[PDB]
Design a protein around this ligand. Structure first.
Ligand SMILES: CCCCCCCC/C=C\CCCCCCCC(=O)O[C@@H](COC(=O)CCCCCCCCCCCCCCC)COP(=O)([O-])OCC[N+](C)(C)C
Ligand SMILES: CCCCCCCC/C=C\CCCCCCCC(=O)O[C@@H](COC(=O)CCCCCCCCCCCCCCC)COP(=O)([O-])OCC[N+](C)(C)C
Ligand SMILES: CCCCCCCC/C=C\CCCCCCCC(=O)O[C@@H](COC(=O)CCCCCCCCCCCCCCC)COP(=O)([O-])OCC[N+](C)(C)C
Ligand SMILES: CCCCCCCC/C=C\CCCCCCCC(=O)O[C@@H](COC(=O)CCCCCCCCCCCCCCC)COP(=O)([O-])OCC[N+](C)(C)C
Ligand SMILES: CCCCCCCC/C=C\CCCCCCCC(=O)O[C@@H](COC(=O)CCCCCCCCCCCCCCC)COP(=O)([O-])OCC[N+](C)(C)C
Lengths: 293, 293, 293, 293, 293
């Protein structure tokens, strides 16, 4: 906090008394259904040291959650997005550099609780025949309790090198039919991986026996809208004022297959089955303060 | 709070009615993968007593979480970052001084709860043969409950001397596979240190039997992005207006080795195995209000 | 709240339409490792009655947590900071006076909860031979639950007299290895004071058997950064416009010794073993609105 | 809330477009250790109807927590502050009046919870000899739970008459050694009042066997800093423009004595033992807008 | 929320670009100890339709909690305030009207929770003689939990007619000596109403055996400070510009009597015993924008 140093709040910020020429570019890849978008802003403050440029790759990525193949009632498949990714890269011989990026890895906290209990007991037993009995007892108990919050999808920031920076979204785990949370590597010897399982021993058709997309998480079927911000700085005395950028919106799917062995349904997961990449190259003109492509 | 003294809020702050010449420097160490960055700001308020300069060493440090060595299925190793560090130092004969630093040690709180319970009981027992029995009893219980929040990574501020100040990030403990939180010194006589253990008695290959990086904390594999702020003040009447600074982004790793003894997997940890340091020297020109290197 | 009286917020504050000449002084005591700092601000509002001056003794104090003496494996010592202190004093014959101070003693609250429970029970017992039995019973229970938050270090404000004001930080208690919170006066007949105890009956060397500094609280090893604010007012018609101030950053340590009696480790604490004081005298010139020393 | 009536926020406030001549007075009573302070502010808005004056009696009161008398090991005494008080009074024949006061009595809330439980049970018992037995039972339970927050010190506002207004701080109850909260009237037939008791049956000296001041609440030993605000209004056409005020900072202590009867320590409390009052008379000049004394 | 309609926040408010002539009136009724106060404000916005006037009857009402009569040790009485009231009324033939009032009745919410539990059990019993026994059982449980917050004093708004509007404060219930909350109609066949009962079977004098005022709620003994706001609007073309207002601060007490029957103390409550009213008539001059009386 800039105010915790006695520095007046906002003194160290940049962007005062300057005109920023923003813009927008929208392009849709019908083949992959990735409504990618970039929102940039040229900031050139005379009090600064280098020209600035912030790229907000808002865009949007489809879910692609459907049964790709069905083979009778014996077995059927299913493809779902395991992880979403978006990254920005620059030419190796280029002069511009990546400075900052808002969504970054953050430390996680977990609660903890220890319980210690003492106890005592004593009773008198008697009956019609006049027998009298006694009982004295005691007990101790110790208990450790740990709780934490684990989101279904956990955003991560891949190691940002100078020339390229890339984010990532993965599938931590999901809760199905109010049962214990499952994940890709969850296994059960009898049923197997029950992540996307409708009924344990249903008699319906193989393809029909799948978890409803509405019940599952919104990202899987309805897509995930990203919001990542990066800032690019380039020296104001550079001989060449043209820069090239590349934007990637790759998405990784998985294969989920149900198998009827003799009585119950069995499920198996094949992580990293298909990968779809949609890369477009943009051009930057620092002199004209415009990104067009 | 400046407002709790009846002083109008922000009156004691510095930076009003002045022009601040900010800047930026970005350099990447491919050898160590440390995308270090410094964001400075020259504040020279005539109402102040000394020139000011705030260095925000945002930067970023890679994770370097991989199996460095594998030796068949008998055993395999693993290297992970135990602690991240970043510090700023000045020449001993220099005249500038360190004034403040935002992230600082903070007191920690823990809950507490004491429980006391009384009880009474009485029942009548009878059967077909007409036997009637009685029972009177009582019990007491006392319970102490203590809970607190312990983050996986706990930031610390090393003893800040005048010439140098240094922060630190360490590995408090981690939760594995929803089991009890482990740490570097955790030991189990049968299995041993089970921090990064995939399966207790899995039959897979030695190298494969490791916790997935996605399951583990984000910092270990995807790196840690620091945000530390320091302010440097130098007298306005100093004969020499040039100052030299040094920035360090050292990172410490550890060695984790799994051993198959006869049936189960055994794990051992060797703290402070390797250390990587990447120091760069910057130059400060108070007269020109610019940091270049 | 000034707004709860219908007075417009901030009307009663002081510091409007005036120029404040702030400053800074930094000095480091290598002998004691106390990076003391003072940040002042001269406020002289014509609408006010007396000149004002606020001293923010931010500074910083080292931890000094190390094993001072080791004597073989039989026993070893340990010195840790029991309490931190910082206070401001004025000459007895001086004319300036202490007005206010932000961090002040605050009331503490504790939860409370009373539970009352009734119960009834009735069962029928029968067997193969046709015997039928009955049982009717009842029970009552009363329970008192009390929980509160107790920080490890509890800041206190010593009785502020006109000429001097002094704060204080003490060691309330600590939680070790997720066990019951201990404190200086905690005693156990078998083991003794187990505050800084690594293992109850470890076979390692005497000096090695100590709690890791990382596990313990951050203040003990990495130091404590204070932030206390005071305001000094002096009459504007005083004949002499020069004032002298004294700043103290005294820190108190303790001695902790482990003793191996026959099988287990025994620990004893000797409170108030050593005291370190580092006092520097500053000079105030109200006429020139500057503090220099 | 002025905004809940559709009136623009702050429209009804007073203090706009006016100059307020604030001030300060500091005086210390070494005899009683009461660093009393008054911070006033003259508000005279032409749009208003009467002149205004707000007195903020911040000040500070010492704790005075020490063993006043010790008589061997048989018994010893102890004096602690039972209640703090501060009030403002005006001459009976005066014309000024008390209008408002910020800290005022507030309603208190308490939680509540009712629990109802049904239960059923049935088991089959069998042994090697083939005997088969059954058991069917049921139970009901009702539970009332009530919890609330009770601070150690509870501020109160004495009945404010026109000429004088007075606040009050009392000792609600305290928690000792993590045991049940005690208070002045708490009594135990065996031990007695165990409020400030160190050990139930300790063998140390009578004077030494007292609760450490650090463990007890901060107010008792380190003093209590008050913050009460009052506003005084006087007609602008009054013939006499001079007004006299009186400020009181009375503090009430108590006597606590431990008695060793035969084996254990016994404690008794004598409420309202001593009272200390420190009254100073200030003078107000509405015409000159200044309070001096 | 005016901003939820897309209307810019504060557009519909009234009071912009206008001068408000506020005021104040203070009068104390020594007979009843009711430090009544009214704070008004004349708002006349040309963009408005009618003249406005807001009356904030802050004032303050004493508690009057004392033992009115004592008759030996056999029995004694006690008078406490059951309910506080404040209302504003206008002449029937008057033309002004009541528009709004801030403190208004609000809906109350209560939590709810349903619990369902299944259970199974099975054990094997064996002894030295080789007898082996078994036991299999199961159980079910259902539980409804409801909790809510009930303040001791619950403010209410009486049916506001055009000519008069009146608020009300009543005594919902109180918690005594950490026991179940009692109220006026609470009855116990053995002891009776135990609201203000010190000891169930104490041997002290009848008058002394009362709950300490400090333990009870602050309002009962130390008084209640009200804060109610009303706005009065009168047409700008009215022939007569003078209006009369009446302010009432009536307070209702109760009689509480303890009776020693043979062994224990018995308590009875007589609701609505005495009523005190203190009405003063104010005069309003819209033309001069002043309220004087
Ligand atoms: C290693 C040594 C061996 C163990 C020694 C003793 C244990 C076994 C004894 C033997 C079993 C006998 C049981 C009797 C009572 C048990 C509680 C007790 O002993 O003290 C308790 C005090 O906690 C309290 O607050 C007191 C409990 C009742 C309070 C009643 C107050 C007034 C009574 C009138 C009521 C009406 C009015 C109510 C108020 C208005 C707890 O203390 P402790 O138990 O000594 O705790 C240390 C020991 N331990 C950790 C191992 C458990
Ligand atoms: C050291 C001295 C020895 C112990 C003495 C006594 C204990 C053993 C006795 C012997 C065992 C006999 C058990 C009988 C009852 C037990 C509760 C009791 O005694 O009083 C309880 C009062 O708490 C209440 O609120 C009353 C409980 C029922 C309320 C019913 C209200 C109206 C009844 C109609 C219902 C329908 C309508 C319901 C309402 C609309 C608790 O008080 P205590 O228990 O005296 O607590 C101090 C003692 N102790 C700390 C050691 C526990
Ligand atoms: C000092 C006097 C002696 C004690 C007198 C009685 C106790 C011992 C009796 C004897 C033991 C016999 C036990 C029978 C029931 C116990 C509960 C009971 O009595 O009333 C309870 C009412 O609470 C309820 O809400 C009712 C409980 C069941 C509700 C069923 C609703 C419809 C039934 C169809 C279900 C299907 C559909 C469900 C709905 C859709 C509680 O009231 P109480 O218990 O009278 O409380 C005062 C007494 N006490 C404080 C001392 C405990
Ligand atoms: C005054 C009248 C006398 C009392 C009448 C009955 C009580 C004693 C009877 C006699 C004792 C016999 C016990 C049998 C069951 C007890 C529960 C029951 O009766 O109904 C419960 C329904 O609550 C539920 O939700 C149903 C419980 C099981 C659900 C199973 C679903 C599918 C089964 C397949 C499982 C696998 C798959 C699971 C799902 C995927 C509760 O209703 P109630 O108990 O009627 O409540 C009113 C009565 N009472 C208030 C007095 C309690
Ligand atoms: C109306 C019909 C009659 C009732 C039919 C059955 C009840 C009585 C049966 C008869 C009693 C026999 C008891 C056996 C088990 C009871 C639980 C059970 O049946 O299934 C449970 C599944 O919940 C789970 O998640 C499974 C429980 C254990 C998981 C173990 C995982 C791997 C095993 C290795 C462990 C090591 C590694 C662990 C993992 C790494 C609950 O399902 P349900 O009970 O069928 O619920 C519906 C029925 N009911 C509502 C009426 C209750």
């Amino acid at each position: 906090a800039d105010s915790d140093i006695n520095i007046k709040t906002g003194t160290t910020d940049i962007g005062s008394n300057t005109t920023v020429k923003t813009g927008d570019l929208v392009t849709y890849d019908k083949e992959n259904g990735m409504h990618k978008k970039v929102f940039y802003s040229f900031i050139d403050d005379k009090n600064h040291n280098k020209k600035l440029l912030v790229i907000r790759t808002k865009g949007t990525i489809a879910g692609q959650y459907r049964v790709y193949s069905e083979e009778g009632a014996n077995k059927s498949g299913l493809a779902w997005p395991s992880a979403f990714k978006v990254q920005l890269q620059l030419p190796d011989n280029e002069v511009a550099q990546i400075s900052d990026y808002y969504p970054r890895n953050s430390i996680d906290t977990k609660e903890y609780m220890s319980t210690l209990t003492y106890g005592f007991n004593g009773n008198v037993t008697g009956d019609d025949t006049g027998k009298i009995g006694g009982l004295i007892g005691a007990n101790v108990s110790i208990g450790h309790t740990l709780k934490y919050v684990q989101p279904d999808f956990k955003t991560i920031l891949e190691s940002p090198t100078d020339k390229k920076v890339g984010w990532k979204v993965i599938f931590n785990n999901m809760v199905n039919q109010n049962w214990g949370p499952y994940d890709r590597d969850s296994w059960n010897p009898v049923y197997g991986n029950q992540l996307f399982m409708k009924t344990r021993n249903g008699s319906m058709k193989a393809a029909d026996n799948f978890l409803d997309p509405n019940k599952a998480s919104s990202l899987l079927s309805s897509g995930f809208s990203p919001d990542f911000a990066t800032v690019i700085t380039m020296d104001r005395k550079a001989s060449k004022q043209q820069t090239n950028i590349d934007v990637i919106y790759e998405r990784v799917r998985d294969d989920y297959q149900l198998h009827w062995t003799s009585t119950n349904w069995k499920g198996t997961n094949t992580k990293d089955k298909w990968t779809d990449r949609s890369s477009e190259r943009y051009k930057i003109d620092w002199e004209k303060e415009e990104m067009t492509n």
